[PDB]
Amino acid sequence: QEPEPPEPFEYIDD
Amino acid sequence: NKYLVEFRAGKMSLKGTTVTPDKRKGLVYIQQTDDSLIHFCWKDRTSGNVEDDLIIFPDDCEFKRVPQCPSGRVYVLKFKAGSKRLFFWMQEPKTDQDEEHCRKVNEYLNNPP
Amino acid sequence: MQIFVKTLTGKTITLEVEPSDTIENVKAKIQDKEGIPPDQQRLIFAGRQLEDGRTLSDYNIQKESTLHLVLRLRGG
C-alpha cells in the first residue's frame, strides 16, 4: 500500500 | 486558494551529521495567497493538520535531492536566504510523479505564479 | 549589520541595522527610505513573516541579509 521510511544516514555539506 | 503542489512526504531530523527520518508521515503542499506569497506548508498525515506553514519567496530556497544515501526518495529544502535546511522523504508508492512534484516545488518556490 | 530589502518591484534597499534591533525599528527605517508605514509594510525573512518586537538576530538576519518586503493594498 505505502512505502516504508528509509534508514538513517550520515550527511555532509560537500 | 488552490495548491500549487502537493505530495506525500515526511519530515526528518538532522543532528550533527546524521539524518534520521521521522515516522510522522506528512504532506508537502504549496499554495499561493492573494498576497502573491507562496506558502510552503507541511501537514502531518496523522491528523491531517498543517503543522508547518512558511512563506517562501523566489530564489529564497532550493528544493533538491540528497545524494548521500541512495535507496529511497529523500529531498532537502535549502533556504538560500533563510540559512536553514529542511529534510523530507517521499511516502508516495510510485515515483512516476516524484520528479514532477520536485520540479513543481522548485518552480513554485523559485518561480511563483 | 545592514540588510537588503527587496521590494515587490525588485527594488532593493539596504538599511544599516543592528542584530538587536527590533523589526519595528527596521520597518521605520524603510519608511524613511521609502515611506511605507508598518501597516502597509510587511517584512518577511527566514521563510517566515517577521513579528514586530522580535530582534533581527531572532530570525538569524545577518548583514546583507535579503529581506522580503510585502506591500498591502494601495487603496485600489
Added chain:
Amino acid sequence: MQIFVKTLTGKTITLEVEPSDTIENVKAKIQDKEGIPPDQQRLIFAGKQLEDGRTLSDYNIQKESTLHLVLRLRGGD
C-alpha cells in the same frame, strides 16, 4: 453610499454603507439582510478581497457598486 451586493443566485441586495465604513460593518448588513453569518460570506470587489479591518474606500468602493458575494456551501471542515 449604498452598494449593490450580488449573491451566488444572482439576487442583488443593496446595502446602505458609508465610504469610511469597515468591511465588518458591511458583512453585518448582509447578515441582517439574508441571515448570512460572518463565517459564511466573502466580499470581493474589483477582484480584490475585502479583508477584515479595511474600509469600502480602501477598495475604491463608491455608491451603487456591485460586489461579489460568495457563500461557503461546503462549509469547510
